[PDB]
Amino acid sequence: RLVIYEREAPEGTVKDIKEQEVYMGEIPLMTDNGTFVINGTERVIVSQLH
Amino acid sequence: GNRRIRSVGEMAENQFRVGLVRVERAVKERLSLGDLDTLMPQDMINAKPI
Amino acid sequence: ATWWIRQAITRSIADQARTIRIPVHMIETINKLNRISRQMLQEMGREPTPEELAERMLMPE
């Protein structure tokens, strides 16, 4: 949602454009068994200890 | 008790976070100049960086 | 001077910012694709095939 407030006025919007679902990247998905496919290659992301 | 266990879901969230921050730089960048009803939440957000 | 200074900067980036030096008409041709592929990318949801922005470009495509 994009809002534009009136110039020098108590916050009221001149117009607001609700841009339906802007696309930002494909996030990889985890398979039924906990692996990922990244380039036709099954990969596992090891949990980390910090 | 002073070592802690992340995993895929947490670490991915941190990476997508860092993805947004670099689209935040670009969002404010464009909002510096923008006209009214012309542009929309699309002309701003770049998916390849995310 | 603002035009004379901003001329020399951008007219220089055209020449000596590239390892393989390209003409300015290529650099503006290129930006056309990047600005188009910012639209085409999200505007579609996948992204443009080499023959999709071929149409949206006047170029021999």
UniProtKB/Swiss-Prot annotation, chain A:
It comes from the Bacteria. Acetylated on several lysine residues in the presence of glucose. Co-administration of salinamide and rifampicin or salinamide and myxopyronin suppresses the emergence of resistance to both antibiotics. Belongs to the RNA polymerase beta chain family. DNA-dependent RNA polymerase (RNAP) catalyzes the transcription of DNA into RNA using the four ribonucleoside triphosphates as substrates. Resistance to the antibiotics salinamide A, salinamide B, rifampicin, streptolydigin, CBR703, myxopyronin, and lipiarmycin can result from mutations in this protein. The RNAP catalytic core consists of 2 alpha, 1 beta, 1 beta' and 1 omega subunit. When a sigma factor is associated with the core the holoenzyme is formed, which can initiate transcription. The rRNA transcription and antitermination complex (rrnTAC) consists of RNAP, NusA, NusB, NusE (rpsJ), NusG, SubB, ribosomal protein S4, DNA and precursor rRNA; S4 is more flexible than other subunits. In pull-down experiments interacts with CedA. (Microbial infection) Interacts (via flap domain) with Escherichia phage lambda antitermination protein Q; this interaction renders bacterial RNAP resistant to transcription pausing and allows it to read through termination signals. This is DNA-directed RNA polymerase subunit beta. It comes from Escherichia coli (strain K12). The chain holds residues 101 to 150 of 1342 of the full protein.
Curated annotation (Swiss-Prot), chain C:
Coiled coil: none annotated. It is found in: Cytoplasm. Belongs to the sigma-70 factor family. RpoD/SigA subfamily. Sigma factors are initiation factors that promote the attachment of RNA polymerase to specific initiation sites and are then released. This sigma factor is the primary sigma factor during exponential growth. Preferentially transcribes genes associated with fast growth, such as ribosomal operons, other protein-synthesis related genes, rRNA- and tRNA-encoding genes and prfB. Contains 4 domains, connected by flexible linkers. In the active conformation, the domains are in an extended conformation, each making extensive interactions with the RNA polymerase catalytic core. In the autoinhibited state, sigma-70 factor domain-1 packs closely together with sigma-70 factor domains-2 and -4, contrary to the extended conformation that is seen when the protein is part of the RNA polymerase holoenzyme. Interacts transiently with the RNA polymerase catalytic core formed by RpoA, RpoB, RpoC and RpoZ (2 alpha, 1 beta, 1 beta' and 1 omega subunit) to form the RNA polymerase holoenzyme that can initiate transcription. Identified in a complex containing RpoD, the RNA polymerase subunits RpoA, RpoB and RpoZ, CRP and DNA. Interacts with Rsd; this prevents interaction with the RNA polymerase catalytic core and with promoter DNA, and as a consequence, promotes transcription from promoters that require alternative sigma factors. (Microbial infection) Interacts with Escherichia phage lambda antitermination protein Q. This is RNA polymerase sigma factor RpoD.
